[PDB]
Design a protein around this ligand. Structure first.
Ligand SMILES: Cc1ccc(C(=O)Nc2ccc(CN3CCN(C)CC3)c(C(F)(F)F)c2)cc1C#Cc1cnc2[nH]ncc2c1
Lengths: 92, 920
């Protein structure tokens, strides 16, 4: 239930998999800053959510990839959005 | 205020001036359809007092004769005029004298009756304060005043009044309510009630006297609405093609099965006759029995009382006039023998089965008539069953098997009970064995262990948890079945629960019986009262003694029984005071038909806004590491008294906990690994005797007792169990495996562990024996999960290993050094990411509050089961502890039998259902 864009992000722009992770989510999760920037420049949904409510900013700041956080913020992202548990990318 | 009604045959509204209206006489509401009787036979069905008044007799002695025809009623008045009568003032004075000889709701009704065509309660709350009684103020309150009328389903939220009930002349919710009311008011039937008043010409059946059974009902007066009610109820008749003709019933199914239920009157007779003509064969007598049963039910429920005479017509020889004999005489003859003999020349006789085939219980189902030879039926006094507490029941033997015999002294009750019983075949309902014709009795199967009431009173030791669940589940099944057939049990009591087998895995354990008070709903019935009674019964099952020994108190606190979560909630919701909020019996059974209902021993909720990251179990009690702040708080939760305590012991968040045991000196020290890297050793006996071991370079993330310390830099430090008590103890050796790669897993079974993305093994010599790289499994799950830290390791024959923020659990063979998807299991049956594992079966606690269960052979999903899981582990009756979050912390103590018992029930119910599939 994944598209080659999913695998490219790991190693459609908003198509989701079993876990709700769109390419963006996985790009901000693994730590590929360039892939995140490419995806936002390609028209990504910086306000998307997975099956657990996490946003691309959530995974970007969840692992310490602050450069991806800045790239998302400069591209219309919401810094106060909440997850399933109500936490924000600022919280993580 | 008062209600006045015009009754009788006929000025109607002409005499009312002296359909609903208002008139002061004190103000009254007049309905033209005390009670005023306008004057000769319609007054008897009307009979609250009735006043006789002449029908404007202005057309003398004739009026007096007509009055004395019926009078020789409260009084008589000669109002002999359509207007301005001489005695009109006298009639008004008499009516005033007769009439003279929820107040808040009455006041509020004026505002209530302001609907141009539910929300009325809001109007009762906006402009009133006492109406806040709500539940206690609206139990019956409006139908008593004829305004805003409200088992009618369309009555709770429904509130044209009586004139439209208009259909006799010729909103969707309003139309549905009108249809329901017309069905209730017997104006229209779910086959009209005013079809015709002339009996249609009937077909010609067999007219032989020896071939027909004729039952006559001589009634002096016809009650009003009798025929319409009989038409409505003479429809659920079955001989196992209803060519039905309707008039003010010719129900013929076959040339040998028909009921000619009609009414008539002879020329030389002032009363009325109801005639039933049935064929005297094997099938028609069933129809006759059903028709007699329905007529008796109508004259007992709808129209109590009514002197009614029952005759049966018999002819010794064909071609002779039918001779009518009272049913009491025929019953006496059937009790004495089975032949009616002519008193004159006693040589011609006729069996009762050919005359009154309902006094000898004739034509009962083929598999049910009692064979007088096989059964013992020895109803000797003092050879009772239950010492007579079950009525007049003794013991006997039917076909070599013991049975219970109930003697019936009075034929009405036996036939009513048999008709009730012949359509109740359920695994949880006691089943009919013998009809019991000649002794006039009823024989049932026997329960060896008495009733459940006796078990709860005395034999409490043998009643285990699974036995309680099985009894309650079977009784709920029975109640649900009873309500499925629109049958209402009176009051479900422990005395009505018979126990056959005490083996917990048997298909049937408890049964419901009714051998002809405190277990009462607040409203009293209705099935909501039955659910209330079942809630009380389950309260008395969970609490073994309970209310049968002596708004309810909490069962696990008043009586001190072992806690049973998910059953106390069911009791609470069943015993809800509002009948609309009680669950239906089907829903109650589904709640009982729960795998997690039996095993869930304990459920503890921790103080609000507390975060616990790790726990350990003493061997009951639990130590917990609070992580809702930047201070190291150690909490102590007692699983018995739920005495949650906490204290600050460290300057940094406590990350891991372990328990060193020293049987040599009988010591037990809890070691706490903190974020700053300090191992805090505290004697579990007292918190004062505490110290610290050698401080680690980085955070301490895992501790195991064999004492092994895993840090955030992979520096596994080995501590001898006897040197844990040594203050500032230095480890004998340190593996130093990994890099600045946390060592977070350590398990026994040579023993193994996990750090970063590598698995290591080592023996008693404490050096690396096997190293396995777990990033080679990136083709099965992408690098977002494999490249995470390793958080859990368990072992039986292959290492089951779980990584941080990953819903995938991997399996690695311990020999060749080389796949459970939790999202798949969750979707088939919500975050998915694995937070903890444990082993016994494999238990996987995911971040969304689910606890997946797997077998250790084929990794098959058993059950998926507070919406987070932080850590699950074993403890000791072996149990499982699970900790999760809501943030409101959650502790859940299951019975480790959980993988097995929930399987049993899955088969149990099934085989039990099979019995129903065989009982139909
Ligand atoms: C000897 C005997 C005769 C009759 C019954 C009986 O109950 N029949 C019966 C009738 C009707 C109904 C259902 N109606 C519907 C609505 N009504 C308003 C309420 C109920 C039920 C149902 F069950 F469905 F409710 C059961 C039990 C025994 C027995 C026995 C026995 C067996 N074993 C034993 N061991 N020790 C003692 C002992 C005693």
């Amino acid at each position: 239930g994944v598209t080659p864009l999913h695998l490219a992000a790991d190693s459609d722009v908003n198509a989701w998999d079993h876990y709700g992770f769109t390419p963006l989510h996985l790009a901000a999760h693994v730590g590929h800053l360039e892939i995140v920037e490419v995806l936002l420049k390609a028209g990504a949904d910086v306000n998307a959510q997975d099956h657990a409510g996490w946003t691309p900013l959530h995974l970007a700041a969840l692992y310490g990839h602050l450069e991806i956080v800045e790239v998302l913020l400069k591209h219309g992202a919401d810094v106060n959005a909440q997850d399933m548990w109500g936490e924000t990318p600022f919280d993580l | 205020r008062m209600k006045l009604m015009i009754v009788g045959n006929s000025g109607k509204t002409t005499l009312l001036q002296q359909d609903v209206k208002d008139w002061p006489i004190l103000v009254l509401n007049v309905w033209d359809f005390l009670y005023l009787a306008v004057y000769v036979d319609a007054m008897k069905p009307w009979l609250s007092p009735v006043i006789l008044v002449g029908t404007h007799l202005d057309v003398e002695k004739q009026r007096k004769a007509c009055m004395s025809k019926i009078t020789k009623i409260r009084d008589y008045h000669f109002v002999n005029a359509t207007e301005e009568s001489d005695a009109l003032a006298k009639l008004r004075k008499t009516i005033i004298n007769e009439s003279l000889n929820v107040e808040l709701e009455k006041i509020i009704l004026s505002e209530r009756k302001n609907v141009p065509i539910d929300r009325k309660r809001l109007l009762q709350l906006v402009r009133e304060n006492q109406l806040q009684l709500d539940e206690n103020e609206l139990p019956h309150a409006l139908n008593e005043s004829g305004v805003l009328l409200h088992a009618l389903q369309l009555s709770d939220l429904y509130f044209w009044l009586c004139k439209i009930m208009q259909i006799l002349t010729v909103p969707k919710n309003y139309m549905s309510q009108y249809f329901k009311l017309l069905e209730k008011f017997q104006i229209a039937l779910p086959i009209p009630s005013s079809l015709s008043d002339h009996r249609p010409v009937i077909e010609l059946p067999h007219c032989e006297n020896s071939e027909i059974i004729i039952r006559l009902y001589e009634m002096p007066y016809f009650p009003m609405g009798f025929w319409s009610r009989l038409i409505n109820r003479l429809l659920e008749i079955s001989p196992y093609r209803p060519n039905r003709m309707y008039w003010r019933i010719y129900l013929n199914w076959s040339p040998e099965a028909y009921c000619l239920v009609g009414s008539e009157v002879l020329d030389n007779h002032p009363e009325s006759f109801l005639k039933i003509t049935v064929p005297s064969c094997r099938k028609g007598c069933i129809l006759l029995g059903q028709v007699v049963d329905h007529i008796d039910s109508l004259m007992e429920e709808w129209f109590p009382g009514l002197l009614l005479k029952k005759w049966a017509l018999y002819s010794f020889n064909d071609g002779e006039e039918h001779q009518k004999i009272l049913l009491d005489d025929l019953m006496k003859k059937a009790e004495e023998g089975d032949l009616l003999v002519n008193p004159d020349q006693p040589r011609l006789t006729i069996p009762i089965s050919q005359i009154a085939p309902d006094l000898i219980l004739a034509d009962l189902p083929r598999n049910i008539m009692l064979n007088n030879d096989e059964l013992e039926f020895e109803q000797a006094p003092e050879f009772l069953l239950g010492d007579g507490s079950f009525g007049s029941v003794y013991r006997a033997a039917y076909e070599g098997e013991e049975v219970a015999v109930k003697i019936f002294n009075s034929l009405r009750l036996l036939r009513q009970e048999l008709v009730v019983l012949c359509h109740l075949h359920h695994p949880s309902l006691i089943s009919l064995l013998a009809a019991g014709i000649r002794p006039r009795m009823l024989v049932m199967e026997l329960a060896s262990k008495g009733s459940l009431d006796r078990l709860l009173q005395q034999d409490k030791a043998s009643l285990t948890r699974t036995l309680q669940h099985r009894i309650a589940l079977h009784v709920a099944d029975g109640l649900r079945y009873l309500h499925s057939a629109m049958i209402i049990y009176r009051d479900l009591k422990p005395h009505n629960v018979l126990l056959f087998t005490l083996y917990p895995n048997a298909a049937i354990i408890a049964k419901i019986a009714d051998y002809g008070p405190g277990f009462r709903a607040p409203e009293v019935y209705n099935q909501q009262a039955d659910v209330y009674s079942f809630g009380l019964l389950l309260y008395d099952i969970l609490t073994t003694g309970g209310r049968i020994v002596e708004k309810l108190p909490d069962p696990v606190k008043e009586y001190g029984c072992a806690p049973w979560p998910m059953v106390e909630k069911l009791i609470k919701q069943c015993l809800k005071e509002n009948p609309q909020e009680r669950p239906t019996s089907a829903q109650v059974f589904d709640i009982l038909n729960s795998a997690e209902l039996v095993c869930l021993t304990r459920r503890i909720l921790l103080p609000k806004n507390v975060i616990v990251e790790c726990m350990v179990a003493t061997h009951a009690s639990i130590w917990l590491g609070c992580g809702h702040t930047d201070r190291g708080q150690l909490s102590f939760l007692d699983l018995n008294t739920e005495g949650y305590t906490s204290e600050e012991v460290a300057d940094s968040r406590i990350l891991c906990l372990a328990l060193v045991h020293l049987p040599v000196e009988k010591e037990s020290w809890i070691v706490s690994g903190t974020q700053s890297g300090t191992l805090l050793v505290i004697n579990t006996e007292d918190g004062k005797k505490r110290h610290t071991l050698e401080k680690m370079t980085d955070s301490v993330t895992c501790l195991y007792c064999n004492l092994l310390v895993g840090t955030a830099d992979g520096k596994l430090a080995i501590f001898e169990d006897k040197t844990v008590k040594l203050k500032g103890a230095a480890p004998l050796k340190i593996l130093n495996i990994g890099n600045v790669t946390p060592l977070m897993c350590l398990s026994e079974s040579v023993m193994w562990g996990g750090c970063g993305t590598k698995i290591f093994s080592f023996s008693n010599d404490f050096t690396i024996q096997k190293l396995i790289e777990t990033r080679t499994s990136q083709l099965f799950s992408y690098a977002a999960f494999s490249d995470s830290n390793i958080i859990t390791v368990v072992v039986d024959t292959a290492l089951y290993i779980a990584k941080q923020n990953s819903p995938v659990v991997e399996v690695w063979d311990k020999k060749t050094e080389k796949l459970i998807d939790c999202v798949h299991f969750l979707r088939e049956v919500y975050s998915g990411r694995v937070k903890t594992l444990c082993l016994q079966a494999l238990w996987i606690g995911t971040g969304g509050g689910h606890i997946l269960l797997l077998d250790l052979s084929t990794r098959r999903l058993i059950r998926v089961i507070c919406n987070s899981v932080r850590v699950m582990m074993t403890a000791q009756k072996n149990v499982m502890l699970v900790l999760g979050y809501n943030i409101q912390s959650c502790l859940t103590v299951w019975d480790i039998n959980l993988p097995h018992e929930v399987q049993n029930l899955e088969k149990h119910i099934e085989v039990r259902k099979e019995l129903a599939e065989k009982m139909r």
